[PDB]
Amino acid sequence: ESFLLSKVSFVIKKIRLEKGMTQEDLAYKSNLDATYISGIERNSRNLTIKSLELIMKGLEVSDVVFFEMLIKEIL
């Protein structure tokens, strides 16, 4: 696997979960397919920087907060 993917995908789930949000929820707010959101979260899809931004607007989370929560998961 890719250790990075692991941790990005993890912080996505966390926040998605923190947001009382489901997968098809986030698929809907973020303009992607649910298929894609499941996959991503089992480290079974490869997301580009765009999809990540799309996702971050689905999540309603800034880039500072996200990446602060990313480093924390690295730790």
Chain residues in the site for a second copy (CB under 8 A): 2-5, 7-8, 44, 46-50, 52-53, 56, 63-64, 67-68, 70-71, 74-75
Please say which residue, 20 or 72, places its beta carbon nearer to a second copy: 72
| Least distance between a second copy and beta carbon 45 (Å) | 10
**Rounded distance between C-alpha atoms, residue 72 and residue 23, angstroms:** 23
CB 11 within 8 A of CB 70: yes
* 20/75 with CB nearer a second copy: 75
- Which of 1/20 has CB closer to a second copy? 1
Q: How many CB atoms are located within 10 Å of the residue 47 CB?
A: 19
- Residue 73 CB, shortest distance to a second copy, in Å, is 10
Query: What are the backbone dihedrals phi and psi of residue 2, each rounded to the nearest 5 degrees, phi first?
Result: -105, 115
What is the distance between the alpha carbons of residues 50 and 62, in angstroms, rounded to a whole number? 15
